From a paper:
[name] is an opportunistic pathogen that causes persistent infections in humans. Randomized transposon mutagenesis screens had indicated several genes from the diaminopimelate (DAP) biosynthetic pathway to lysine in [name] as essential, suggesting the corresponding gene products as potential targets for new antibacterial drugs. [name] ([name]) catalyzes the first committed step of the DAP pathway, the condensation of L-aspartate-semialdehyde and pyruvate to 4-hydroxy-2,3,4,5-tetrahydro-L,L-dipicolinic acid, which is non-enzymatically dehydrated to yield L-2,3-diydrodipicolinate. Tetrahydrodipicolinate N-succinyltransferase (DapD) catalyses the transfer of the succinyl moiety of succinyl-CoA to the α-amino group of tetrahydrodipicolinate, the first committed step in the succinylase branch of the DAP biosynthesis pathway present in most Gram-negative bacteria and mycobacteria.
The crystal structure of PaDapA was determined by X-ray crystallography to 1.6 Å resolution. In contrast to most [name] enzymes from Gram-negative bacteria PaDapA is not a homo-tetramer but exists as a homodimer in solution and in the crystal. Size exclusion chromatography suggested only one species with a MW of 60 kDa, i.e. a dimeric structure. This finding is also consistent with native polyacrylamid gel electrophoresis, which only showed one species present in solution. PaDapA is also a dimer in the crystalline state, where the buried surface areas at the dimer interface are 1500 Å2, whereas contacts to other subunits in the crystal lattice involve surfaces of 300–400 Å2. The basic fold of the subunit is an (β/α)8 barrel with a C-terminal extension of approximately 60 amino acid residues folded into an additional small α-helical domain. The reaction mechanism involves a covalent intermediate formed between the substrate pyruvate and an invariant lysine residue at the active site. The [name] gene is not essential for infection in mice, as shown by the ability of the [name] Δ[name] mutant to grow in a mouse acute infection model. The reason for the ability of the [name] knockout mutant to grow in the lungs of infected animals remains unclear, but our data suggest that [name] is not a promising target for the design of novel antibacterials against [name].
Numbering used by the authors:
A (entry chain A): 1 to 291
B (entry chain B): 2 to 291
The structure:
Amino acid sequence: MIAGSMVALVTPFDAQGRLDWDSLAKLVDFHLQEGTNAIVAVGTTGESATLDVEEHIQVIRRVVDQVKGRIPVIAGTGANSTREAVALTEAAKSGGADACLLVTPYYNKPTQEGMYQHFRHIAEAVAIPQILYNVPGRTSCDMLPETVERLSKVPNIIGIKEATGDLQRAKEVIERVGKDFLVYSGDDATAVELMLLGGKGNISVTANVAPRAMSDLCAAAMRGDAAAARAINDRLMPLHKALFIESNPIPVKWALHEMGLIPEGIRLPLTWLSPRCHEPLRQAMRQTGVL
Amino acid sequence: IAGSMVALVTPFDAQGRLDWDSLAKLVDFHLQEGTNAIVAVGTTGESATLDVEEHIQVIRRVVDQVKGRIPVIAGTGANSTREAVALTEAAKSGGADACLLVTPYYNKPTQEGMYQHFRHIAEAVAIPQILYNVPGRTSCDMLPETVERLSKVPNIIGIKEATGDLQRAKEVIERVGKDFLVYSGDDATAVELMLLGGKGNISVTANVAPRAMSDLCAAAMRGDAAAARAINDRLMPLHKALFIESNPIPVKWALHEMGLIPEGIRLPLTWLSPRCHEPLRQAMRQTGVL
Ligand SMILES: [Cl-]
Ligand SMILES: [Cl-]
């Protein structure tokens, strides 16, 4: 089921920037062992922007083939061209993905109607479940709740990753969509509150490094155990903050390399975490018991 | 590379196919009306929805028609350094005089990552390169300290500053060498950026008012503030209405109304909403374009 703690998985690169399949296999085994509910491969945390079409499908198949159906595998397949998004989404389907996550078009600032038409088009073009993703702090556009509600009535559009961290927005979306349309957090610091409001999962950067804790956090929030959920969240807060001290996924790749899970590669225009940021993150990782 | 530089639309037919005859009409319109350069396949040209093959073909077609009469600048930015290098290499082979490279959108690089991205591209491809800062689209802002660093890299010849912030414009102009040229990417304020020492405007409004834009840039660049401002003030209703919905949705409606292009635009962009037709039509009539 496409709910709970879903890791926004990094894509590990060796120091020359090439895909590191051995390291990817370690990460997939770690999630399998620690209670992660789903894996999101080749999204923003996975450096979607710097993977070419051939690499995008390679990663998806390698994750799908290793997971062997044990938990869902969701593929990032958004683009700011409708045509490209269709091609990425068809590739995910061919690759064996259970669902796709599609960011709102970045850069070109479509109207709300253009957002509707874009997602309506992709939903009809490719028969795979699709999850919308609203992150205005990256895309420079905001899919408003009225538009989310319209798309919630389309076949194959199963939910939304809402990344604004605006809990008034979360509540408005949750109120306006059917109970079958699931609202997931895209903001690790506030995800507990979004799930307590009725959301059904967290597509999480923190989960890369604290998957068991995040799995426990989502389960607690999702059953309404507010005290338990907030307790884990409050303990993780320094790590949620540190993991965005420079743009995600720079901090989390540093953290995963410190854990011995991945190599030091990251592709331009992203850079390895600045040394001025290493202390706050290392401290958070020790404090939460991750390292 | 200076003056009124049109941020040229890419015309499509009703089924979304490239309309080469319409493109040629537009290039002739600019040649006749005093436009000083053409920026092909940028933001106003729907770079996002052109595939690699289409991108280069548009550049090739514009270059070949222009025949050296005015500079042709190609939009070649990307949010992957690897992609940006390929676009830039392609434009150079295609005969572009320069390339315009947006700062990486969506993935929010650090300032150091911006430096390394642009310096890599400037080393990789021997074609003049113009930086492009537009935080309202990219969700990152290239700060003047980074602009200055890059202004020392060979091959990096200028910057299109689209923030509309004239204190930002002044800071950039003061920090960089007199050889590194600062161009406006905000039509409403471009006149002031040129009066501050900027050297052109990479303009949406020039698509529909090329003569007026050319006259405005020439006045601003020789320091005739009164004449530059009077032209700009005249055009202001059009500058505003051309962003009533995200550019290039309004300007494509305007160019179709003028009879210059067909009514095609590629998803996720949509044809101008009906409620926006009147204010734009009125602004075009007020300003003498229609
Ligand atoms: Cl971030
Ligand atoms: Cl706009």
